[PDB]
Write a new protein. Structure first.
Ligand SMILES: [Zn+2]
Ligand SMILES: [Zn+2]
Ligand SMILES: [Zn+2]
Ligand SMILES: [Zn+2]
Ligand SMILES: [Zn+2]
Ligand SMILES: [Zn+2]
Lengths: 347, 346, 347, 347
C-alpha cells in the first residue's frame, strides 16, 4: 500500500528554513511515475535554487528540492506503457517537457520553454515519494545500488556531456579545471573511460587525488607561476579540449588562453556574474570554439549510466540522513562540498 | 614570354615606404609554381603587413604585399602533377605549408608552425609574376572573367568558410553583421545560396542593397537603440547563426546577446584590439557556440569558386593599376570605403 | 477650488496604453508640497517606465508618470519652511531624498538609497495636482513662461551638468553626438553659453538647425564616411570634450575614438543593453576619462533655470493635450522623431 | 673620470639579440645632462620597445634601452643653469619635451608631439653614461640609495600618479587589482602613505605580503567565486577608487562592476589587446569615471620621490649585472616578473 504521508525537506521561501517535515505523498499524473526515492544526491544548484539567484523562477510554493534521485517505481499513470512496477527510475534535472517544441524535437529537450525542472519548478528528490515524467525518466539497471547511481544523475551526465561536447578523439589531451572536486573527479574518470589523455588543473592537495583516479597529469596554480606556459609545454601546444569545471572567472580565461590550436573549451557550470573574454584575433587565428554545455539528454544520460554500470566510473560517496540534509546546506554556503554526498531517504 | 624584371613593391625594413620599381624575377621552388597575375584584390591585411604590428614575425626583409590574385600559370617547379601550363590559377592567404604537420594533416593547413603566408613570408599578388605552392593554389575554370574571380579568392572564401562553420541547415535564419560592407554584400548572397533566411545588420541605407541582394529583413543601428530586441523580434527568438564581419566590439557582444539558444556565433576577421565577452551563465543555458573562422580549406575554396562559376554570386569590383595603387591604399589607412579594388597590371 | 477628482494618465499595468482617467487627488504629504502642474514635459525615460525595460523595478502600483512639471503651489503642506502659496515650482526627476546619506551630504542626492523618483517611485507631473518634496522642488521665477521652463526641468539641468562634468575650459572644443535631438539642441545652446566651441554630430538635414543653434561646424554620419577622422580634422586632434546624447552604441565608441588626448567623454543617456568598450592602450596613452553624468544637483538646477531666464537658452515646443500623448509614446518605441512636447493639464 | 668608451646593451634590430657591447660615450647636448647611470630598472615596457609590438616606433633602432635610471651627474651642457656635477639624477620615461605644446603648457609633457622617450627614442639607462634633458630630469637627493630609487622612477611615479588621478580623500577605500605584483606593492604602500584604506585583489594567500604593506582587507580570486559581491561587502558599497595594475581583462570589467557610486576606476598599464567595456546605464546611474593615468609629471615625480626619502615606500629588488640583462629580457618576452630587477651597470 502506497502511503498517504511522507518525510520531505521543504523550504517555503527563498532563504527560508529547510524543513524535515511530514507532507502529503504525491499522486501521479497520467504521464507521470511515482518513485520511492531511496537515495538522492546534492549538487550546489540546490543552494542556488534556495537563494533565488537564477533569473528563473523557483516554484517556491513550499518547494521540495532535488534533481538527482534514485528509486523504484511504485505506481504508474494511465498512459504510461513502457514502465513496469518494480523498475528502477531516476529523477533528473529535466522533469518533463512539451515534447513538440523546436528544441524538444531536436535532441536537446531541457531547453524547451515549457520545461518542468525537478527541484526548481517541481518537487524534487529530497522526499520519500516523487513524481516524474515517464518519458524523461531514467532507466536504471537492476543489479546496481541506487546509492552509487544517485550522483551519476546530475554529475556523471553533465561531465560526460561536456566531454562529448569537446568532440575529442581517442588519444587527444583534455584539461580539467577544478579537477580536485567531485565533478572534477568524475570528469577525470569519464575522460579516461573515453581513452583521453587527461591533464588536471587545481589548487591544493589534489595532486595525489587525480593520480588516485588515474589522471595522467596534474597542475597546481599555487606553485606553478603561469598555467598557460606549463600546460602548453606538457601538451605540446595546448590541450585538444578543455573542461571548465571551476566557476572561478580566472581559470576560464586561462583555459581559453592555453587551449590548443583548433581546440575546444567548454563551459559546464551555471555561475553568476562570471564572463569569459577572449581576443577575437586569437580566436580566429587558432579557430578555438567556446561551447556551453547544459544538462544532457536522455541518450547522454543512458551512456553515462552504462559507464558506471560497466564499472568504468566509481565515485566514492558519503551517505547521510534526510534529517541531516539541513547541515549539508550550511556546508554549501561555506564551500565545504564533501566529495559526493548521497542522502538515504529512509533515515 | 617571361621578362627579367617585374614591377613590384618592396620594403627594405620595417617602417619604410613602397615604390613601383622592377625587381628580379623570383625563382620557382621545386613544388612551387610561377603565375602571371592578371588581376589582384586588396584587403586590409595587406594594410597590416606594414608597421610590423601583427605579432607573428614578418618578412622585414624585402617583401611584396598582396595575397588574393588571379592570373595564368606560366611555369612550374620540379615536382608538380595536376597542373598544366596555360591554366588560370589564384593565390590566396596560405601560400604553402608543412604538408605533414598535425594541423596540416588534419586538413587545415593555415595552422601549421611552418605556414607560409603570401604577402607576409613570400612575395604576394602585388607583383606581375609570383611563386606559390601548387598544392595550396586556386583552380579556376576557363570562361570566367578574372576581374570577378579576384574577390572570391579572399572575401568570398572567407564568407563561405564562416557560413560553413555555423553548421546551419537549409531554412534556418542567419544574421550578418556589417552586411552593407563588401564582406556583407558577399555573405548575404552566399547565405541565400544555402537556402538561408538572411537578416542583415548595418548602419545607414545600405539596406536597399541588402534587401535586394535577397535578404529577408534588415536592421539599422541608427534607428534602433536595442538591436538585440528588434533582431529577436524579427527572428522569433534570435538567429540560429551570426557572422561577425563588423570589427566593432559592440556587434560582437550583441551577436552573443541576440543569438538563438543552441546558436552559433562566428568570428571572421583578423581584428586588432577586439574582445568578445559573454556571460558563462547564458552561454551554458543557451548552449551557445562562439567559434572563430580563419581561412577556408582547398575544398571550401573550390565550393566558393564554383559558386562564382555557376552564377549564384555577383560582385562589384573596380580596376586600378599596381602602379597607381597607393592612393586607394593610404585612403584605406583611413579605411576608405572602396568597391572591390582589383589590380590590372596594365 | 482644488478638486477631489482629477484627470491624469495612469498605467496600473506595465505596458498598457494608459488611459486618460479620473483618479483621486493625492493626499498631501507631511513634509511634501502640492503643485498644480499647468505644463508637463515628456522625455524618453517616460517610455522606459512604461516598457518595464529598466532593471530598477518601477512602482508596481497605479503610476501617473512625469519628471518634468511646471506649476503653481496651490497648497503648502506641513513641515515646509519657505514655500508660499502662489509661488511657481518645478517637479524634477528627483522627487525626494534621505538628505542624510553618504552621497546626500556629498551634494548629489539622486544616489541615495531611499530616493523617490518622479514618474517612477512617486506619482509624477502628468496629473493635475502632484506631490513633491519641498527641498528638491524647483524654484521657478514668477513672471516666466511655464511652458518653456518645463523642458529645462529634465533636459536643461541634465545637459548643463553633463557640460559641467566635461570640466571644459573657455575656448576648448566640445563635440555633441545626437546634437539634433531634444537633448542635443539644448546641449549646443548651453555649451555655447559656457564659451565652448561646439561641434555637432547627427544624421540628416539637421545641420542648419545645429549651426543656427551656434554650432561652429557640423559633421553628418549620413554623408561623412569616417566620423573619427573628420572630427579630428575639424578640431586639430579631437574635441577636448564629448557629450554622448544618442543611445546608439556606434557614436559612443566613436566618441572614445576621436576625443582628443587628455580629453573627457561624458555619457548622459539612460540606455538599454548598451556597453562602451575602449582600448586600454589608447585610453591610457591618451589619458581619456569616460565619465557618466546622471541628474544634476539643486545648484545645477538653478544655474540652468538662470540660463533660461536670462535668455541664453531657448527651447522649442509644440504644446499638446494630455490626450494623444499615447501617439507620442508609440512614436518613441517606433524609433522616430516628433519634437519636444509640453502638455497643458487643462486640455 | 670620463673615458670615451662604455658598456651598454644595444640591439640594432627589433628582435635582434641584445649585445653587451662597448660603445662610445654620448656627447652631451647644451640643454642635456650626462649621468653616470649606476643603477637601472627593467620593466616590461623595455621588452615592448624591443619587440616593436607597440603602435609607436622605437625609431632609434640602434638603441640602448631603459626608462628608469639612477646615477650621478658627471657632466652638463652649456644651458644647464641649476644642475651640479655630483648631484644625483634620474632618467625617467619622458626624456625631453618641446616645452611649448598645448599638452606641455597643461603640465603633461609625455603627451607632447615632439617628446623624446628614454629607451625608445633616445638612448636609455642600459648604458653606463646616459644623456637626459636637464628640465625633465629627476632630482634625487644625495644620501639615498640609487639601487632602491631606480624602481621608483617608473613604478613609484606611475602608481602615485594613478592614485592622484583617483582624486580620493583620506579615509576612503581604494581597491588595488593585481596588488601582489611590483606595481601592486608600490601602489599599496603609496595609498597607505596618502591615508587611504587599501583593499587588495590578487592570486594566492602568500599575499600576506599585501597585508604587510598596509592593505586593510584582501580578496583572493582563488577562494572567492564572485569578487564583486564580497568586495562590496567588505567596503560597504564598493571601493571609492580602483587602481587597475593587472592587465587581465576580467579584472578591469570587474573593477568597473564593484566600484562604489561616484567612484573612479583608473587604468595604469600600457598593455596590448586589452579593452574595458562598461554598461552605459550603470555608468550613468552610478556616475562612474573610467580614467587612464600615463606617466607622471615632474611635480608628481618629486612628490613620489619625497615619499621614498621619508621612508614610507620601499621596493625590495633583485640586483643583477648589466651583462645579465639579456636574461631579464628573455624572461619578460615569455612571462611576467618574479620581482623588481635592478642592474648594477658596473657588472
Ligand atoms: Zn546537480
Ligand atoms: Zn518544448
Ligand atoms: Zn582579403
Ligand atoms: Zn603543417
Ligand atoms: Zn618601469
Ligand atoms: Zn609638447
Amino acid at each position: 500500500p502506497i502511503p498517504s504521508t511522507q518525510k520531505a525537506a521543504v523550504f517555503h521561501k527563498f532563504g527560508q528554513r529547510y524543513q524535515f517535515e511530514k507532507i502529503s505523498v504525491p499522486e501521479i499524473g497520467d504521464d507521470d511515475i511515482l518513485v520511492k526515492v531511496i537515495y538522492s544526491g546534492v549538487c550546489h544548484t540546490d543552494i542556488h535554487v534556495w537563494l533565488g539567484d537564477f533569473p528563473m523562477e523557483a516554484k517556491e510554493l513550499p518547494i521540495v528540492g532535488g534533481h538527482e534521485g534514485a528509486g523504484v517505481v511504485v505506481k504508474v499513470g494511465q498512459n504510461v506503457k513502457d514502465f513496469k512496477i518494480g523498475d528502477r527510475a531516476g529523477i533528473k534535472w529535466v522533469n518533463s517537457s512539451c515534447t513538440t517544441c523546436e528544441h524538444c524535437k531536436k535532441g536537446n529537450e531541457p531547453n524547451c520553454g515549457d520545461v518542468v525542472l525537478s527541484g526548481f519548478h517541481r518537487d524534487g528528490s529530497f522526499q520519500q515519494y516523487a513524481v516524474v515524467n515517464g518519458n524523461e525518466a531514467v532507466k536504471i539497471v537492476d543489479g546496481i545500488d541506487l546509492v552509487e547511481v544517485s550522483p551519476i544523475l546530475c554529475a556523471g551526465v553533465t561531465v560526460y556531456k561536456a566531454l562529448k561536447d569537446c568532440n575529442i578523439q581517442a588519444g587527444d589531451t583534455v584539461a580539467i579545471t577544478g579537477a580536485g572536486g567531485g565533478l572534477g573527479s568524475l570528469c577525470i574518470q569519464y575522460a579516461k573511460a573515453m581513452g583521453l589523455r587527461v591533464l588536471a588543473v587545481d589548487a591544493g592537495e589534489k595532486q595525489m587525488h587525480c593520480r588516485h583516479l588515474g589522471a595522467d597529469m596534474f597542475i597546481n596554480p599555487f606553485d606553478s607561476p603561469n598555467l598557460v606556459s606549463d600546460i602548453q609545454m606538457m601538451t605540446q601546444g595546448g590541450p585538444h579540449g578543455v573542461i571548465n569545471l571551476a566557476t572561478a572567472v580566472k581559470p576560464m580565461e586561462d583555459a581559453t588562453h592555453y587551449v590548443r590550436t583548433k581546440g575546444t573549451v567548454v563551459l559546464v557550470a551555471l555561475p553568476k556574474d562570471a564572463k569569459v573574454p577572449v581576443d577575437v584575433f586569437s580566436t580566429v587565428t587558432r579557430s578555438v570554439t567556446v561551447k556551453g554545455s547544459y544538462v544532457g539528454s536522455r541518450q547522454d544520460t543512458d551512456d553515462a549510466l552504462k559507464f558506471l554500470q560497466r564499472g568504468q566510473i566509481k565515485i566514492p560517496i558519503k551517505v547521510l540522513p534526510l534529517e541531516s540534509l539541513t547541515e549539508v546546506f550550511d556546508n554549501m554556503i561555506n564551500h565545504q562540498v564533501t566529495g559526493r554526498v548521497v542522502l538515504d531517504l529512509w533515515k
